[PDB]
Amino acid sequence: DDIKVAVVGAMSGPIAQWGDMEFNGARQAIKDINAKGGIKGDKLVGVEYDDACDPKQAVAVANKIVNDGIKYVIGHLCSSSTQPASDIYEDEGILMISPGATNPELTQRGYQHIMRTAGLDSSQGPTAAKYILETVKPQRVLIVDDAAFMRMMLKDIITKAGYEVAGEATNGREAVEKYKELKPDIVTMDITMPEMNGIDAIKEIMKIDPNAKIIVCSAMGQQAMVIEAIKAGAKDFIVKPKRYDQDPANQGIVDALKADKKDPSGPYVWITYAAVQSLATALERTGSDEPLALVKDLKANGANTVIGPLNWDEKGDLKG
């Protein structure tokens, strides 16, 4: 009667600090769901795997999950690990909901067992630090952000991982002055506040260097400005999500994570929690064990989660 659910992420390697978030949220969601009666009396059982956000290790984990007979997978955490694993899950008829894969090719191959609770509106994750360690090689970074605490947080993460902080800028004017003086290999630029004038700063940098690598960070609702940044020459964009830990409806989970001395501010805590809730919603609403029926139910009816009401299109991507 037990319902085994695989949870796959990075328990080791460079992406480990965000994998800790994923497993913390997944564990708490399974605990909370079982304390509410599980799935009509049936107990959810989490089976945790470590792919180290490595493509080869992720394929071994996917084969291990297939040999275990597990039908539902929450994962993986990184795009380059979730993509080859999703081929195996789709071939074996295994449901897979990823809380971290944001590559576009994941949901553009007609796969009917693949979903995700991340990457809304082509966003490349909630944090720029993880995107940097996962996508780009160690090089000289120019951090452009008005908030000084956001710069020190990003600086500490990439410096420990072998990256170099060439300089820091607080507004769009200084960002151009710093790009002239330092000529960095990559630029991260938060364009949330209007005083930054990020779009104008991108164009001014593009005039100096047409091959500039600029990664922009934005907030919810700034979709139109994000397209202008990419049109101006930006390579990719990060959308900072709403602080779900500050939602008063989520206070009980915040309290539960704090009692375990776990940081509840991480976005992957709630994105992974939402993925578990979505699977539990489909299992309870349909009363079916078939992954295809569960995915079809979620695409038709959605689910209420700790990150808000979720809905998916026919390809498995979030909509709204």
Resolution value (Å, 1 decimal): 2.2
- Helix, strand, coil percentages (3-state) for the chain, rounded to 5, are 50, 20, 30
Distance, CA of 203 to CA of 247 (rounded, Å):
37
Q: Which helix (H) or strand (E) holds 266?
A: none
Q: Which two tokens stand for residue 148?
A: 């000084």
Beta strand 308-310 with 303-305 is antiparallel
Cα 165 to Cα 135, 148, 188: the distances in Å are 17, 14, 11
Last residue of a domain, one of 213, 240, 267: 240
User: Residues 276, 280, 281, CA angle at the centre, nearest 5°?
Assistant: 115
Q: Let me know if residue 250 belongs to a domain.
A: yes
Measured in whole angstroms, the distance separating CA 32 from the mean position of its chain's CA atoms is 22
Enclosing domain of residue 296: 3-120+246-310
Distance, CA of 189 to CA of 187 (rounded, Å):
6
Q: Let me know if residue 216 belongs to a domain.
A: yes
Please enumerate, by residue number, every residue annotated as part of a binding site for Mg(2+).
Answer: 145-146, 190, 192
List alpha helices for the chain, DSSP H.
16-35, 55-68, 79-91, 128-135, 148-160, 172-182, 198-208, 223-232, 251-259, 267-286, 291-301
Residues 6+ apart with CB under 8 A from 243: 265
28 with 109, same domain: the answer is yes
Q: Nearest CA to 27 among 194, 213, 272, 193?
A: 272
Distance, CA of 189 to CA of 69 (rounded, Å):
45
Distance, CA of 127 to CA of 140 (rounded, Å):
19
Residues 6+ apart with CB under 8 A from 24: 257, 260, 262, 266, 269
- Asked whether the beta carbons of 100 and 76 are under 8 A apart, the reply is yes
* Residues β-bridged to residue 312: 318
Q: Let me know if residue 254 belongs to a domain.
A: yes
CATH at 287: 3.40.50.2300
Q: Let me know if residue 319 belongs to a domain.
A: no
Please enumerate, by residue number, every residue annotated as part of a binding site.
Answer: 145-146, 190, 192
269 with 222, same domain: the answer is no
